Symmetry: C3
Subunit: 388 residues, 3 copies
């Protein structure tokens, strides 16, 4: 029995209210600028010669001695074109122990006609012909056909296509014809199919938090305040600010040159574990909520099924009638428009995601070719060989 | 009052239906091939000598001059074994300013007996003994005991154990005895406890999406179409295709040579933020659903508890009776088999995960030993010292 | 009709119970030790000279020949201070083809007074003055002002501030005045605003799993057993073990020197996809649970609304009365304290997270300055030029 004598209240049922959240999903309409060019579009060729012009007139003659030089002869544009097309470099002649008469070979304007697939010079010299000159001449050359990835910078407005050097220096790509240049021993030719930049209009998905965290294919980036940002391979400008002149957000060039340490990646790993534990806490909390709901609903049905003896059968989708032998125990006997009480929509599921990994600039095939060639020159120039 | 006069319908209750998803959890039975070998199993030894054999017969003699050479003398197999075991390299004698009679020391077949822990050569020469020969001889040597990580490639079927060079070239590991080889100055000996490959049968967990995203310890990889893939350290072959000859999926060798840039890792960071925001959206949506449910259930209990005055006490697990003073306000007075309406199972929780981070090949102890030794040779060969 | 004749049971309602989880959220009170110093606090200066002192007395004289040397003259502390302050290095004189009388210039104690912004030496020599000495002298120097990041090690208890060399060697920072040192050609001066270490008391968030996975700003780390760990930039000591002497957990120095490979980062990517699929499975499972709940609640309301014809209107928050024309179809006609049945709290949401990415030691500005200077010395010392 109860004591209906004495009340307490009045009471109300406390509702649960979700915590408001400012994260929304946006499709941001942008103009996307790229400078992509596919295939072997970059040719690198080097050429130099070691020259040793000596005279032996004895220790009394002031002209007794050697005049040695390492001279770079970078190929011309058309030379480099036929080198890459033939995968072959052309040099002058290999001169060894050419004395008094033939020593004039040291200054000929040799008109390069010796063809090699690859050729390293020999650092050889000798001055053992008395009262006479001696000539030694050795050539080096190399060529490679690679693919060059051109990047985008700003320097102001109007993103520009550039080539990034391993030292950090940037070189503008010519928008008229076949950017070519020369640096010491090396000559570089970049020949893309089409010139300039490409621009497309597209929507990129973002999450608005003051802060926009966006995605475009395998690119992931924080979209800035003014709706204009440049990544290495692409620039994203928000229309509505299409007709505005703005300096875009600039990527740091050093991030593409310098490698990431094992410790940095292990830190990202630890941050992922921390977020996975935080995620597991949220999931466990929702699991406990579902357990509370099933306990409440079990008691609610136990109360209502006493009045409606067909309810438990409708819940189980089998025709039956219920009869309780106890407030908790029961026995079982055998037997247009819609309204939405929930307004539940389809559940947003985080999609799969794979970030782009490209490496560092020095690891690129062209700059690796350059670095190896220079290292080979160091390796061959360690000591002088006797051309005797 | 209501107007029971005028109806509208008939209506129905709209149910909520979850969106179907093709992601399943699979335990995939595979044969796993490894080539693991633990401990110091790799010995690297280098040796060379600088020789300067000069003759001074005056400027008239054609034989006046120096014959200099850097000659590599890589140790033999048994030599390298006793070097690593003793942590000591053996070379010939240090010859300095040995002239006419002792200059014959420049060609002796020296029978290496000078022991060093570490030894760099000196590039010294002198030709200041008239009518006489002069000899200079300087030796270099080094040794190291390291651990070598052997990888697996395919070249077809039947994954093979190999050593990967920093330049990308691969060298097969002998499956008979103690793979040994020589390259210029250096000699390499790899001595594992057991030869060949090891194969184990195991189940790896995966998520089936056409696409399989798997995990094995700290290895994470996309399992391919034909159920055969090779990673650097292990190959995974699906039985059912155990008896089939297939080329496995091959890892790209360059991914283990070339480092990842700071920009790449920052991109993964941005992709993680994007996924965390997407995750927060899903969690907030489920939070709003729970708020809607508690509001509905509060009204449902307020309706049913009017009929069953003991229900609210059963929900609160305290004996009490209810009496409503209003459609929303009430006062309170003091007082085998089971059926599953929910069929709820235990909630799948994402487990913790830590990917393996190993670095690049050039950073390995053996190849760092090689690279430093070569750099030391460059450093010592910059100029000739006078052995006078 | 039913057959109230024949029962079955008694039955009970099976509740759902959540799976217990040991992950908790902790605010761990720690003493945090840092050695941070902001700005250009590191000066590096190098200086050397190439000297070629030759004598030409003919092939008969034993003193005929060249005495050449590369000599390092690292600047003093005050010299390096005025170099960095002026961005200018001071050297001796450039001597070329100074013979018999002026050849005494090769040993003068030159009292460096030649100012350069940057200066590379030339490796030039000549011995073409008979019965006379010849002198050649060429200088090199450089300076840079950079920011040095000092790290923390243990060697026992009491974390210590150190500078990490690219080779892995560590050099203690003086806690008294302006740590200065000299290595060959180079001199290094590090001048921080304040000396020693800084310690702050703070709470860091963690997830307790035996295992603690913590976060501090952009630092993410596993907090160890004894509550004492040192990262590169900071050490975390748990009070309660404030008064205890413990060796802290030590970070591996090689993780900050060696870069992470593209394959390592792609593995983290694959581990993220695996966790995202696992997360999607959990979300889909909760989505199916909500679908089951709405189906149960729809039938429960259809049963109770037959008794309370105003209930459906209260659920829809519109005044109406219901009247069922079928067990599933109905028509519609127009019309203090609280109790918590749920005890639901605000949902824990995983917050955003961005790990710190700093790169490798060799990529630091100071060590890049050093590495480039040494490479320039190699480049300039490839062959001797005639000072004639």
């Amino acid at each position: 029995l109860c004591n209906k004598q004495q009340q307490q209240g009045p009471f109300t049922f406390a509702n649960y209210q979700e915590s408001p959240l400012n994260v929304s999903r946006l499709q941001i309409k942008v103009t996307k600028t790229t400078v992509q060019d596919r295939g072997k579009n970059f040719i690198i060729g080097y050429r130099a010669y070691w020259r040793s012009y000596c005279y032996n007139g004895g220790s009394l003659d002031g002209n007794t001695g050697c005049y040695n030089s390492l001279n770079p002869k970078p190929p011309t544009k058309d030379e480099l074109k036929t080198w890459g097309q033939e995968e072959v470099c052309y040099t002058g002649p290999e001169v060894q122990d050419a004395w008094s008469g033939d020593s004039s070979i040291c200054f000929v304007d040799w008109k390069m006609d010796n063809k090699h697939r690859a050729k390293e010079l020999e650092k050889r010299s000798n001055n053992n012909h008395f009262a006479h000159h001696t000539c030694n001449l050795s050539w080096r050359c190399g060529v490679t056909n690679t693919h060059l990835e051109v990047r985008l910078v700003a320097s102001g407005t109007q993103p520009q296509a550039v080539i990034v050097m391993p030292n950090g220096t940037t070189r503008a790509v010519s928008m008229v014809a076949e950017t070519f240049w020369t640096d010491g021993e090396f000559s570089y030719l970049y020949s893309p199919k089409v010139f300039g930049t490409r621009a497309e209009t597209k929507f990129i998905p973002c999450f608005k938090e003051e802060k926009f965290h966006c995605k475009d294919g395998d690119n992931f980036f924080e979209f800035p305040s003014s709706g204009f940002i440049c990544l290495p391979d692409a620039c994203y400008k928000n229309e509505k600010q299409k007709n505005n002149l703005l300096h875009p957000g600039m990527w740091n060039i050093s991030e593409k040159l310098h490698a990431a340490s094992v410790y940095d990646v292990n830190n990202v790993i630890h941050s992922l574990v921390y977020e996975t534990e935080s995620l597991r806490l949220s999931l466990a909390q929702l699991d406990h909520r579902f357990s509370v709901l099933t306990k409440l609903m079990n008691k609610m049905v136990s109360s209502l099924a006493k009045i409606d003896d067909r309810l438990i059968g409708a819940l189980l989708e089998k025709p039956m009638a219920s009869k309780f032998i106890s407030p908790t125990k029961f026995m079982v006997s055998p037997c247009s428009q819609t309204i939405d009480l929930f307004n539940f929509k389809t559940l947003w599921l985080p999609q799969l995601v794979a970030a782009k990994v490209e490496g560092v600039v020095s690891d690129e095939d062209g700059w690796t070719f350059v670095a190896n060639s220079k290292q080979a020159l160091l390796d061959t120039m360690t000591y002088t060989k006797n051309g005797g």
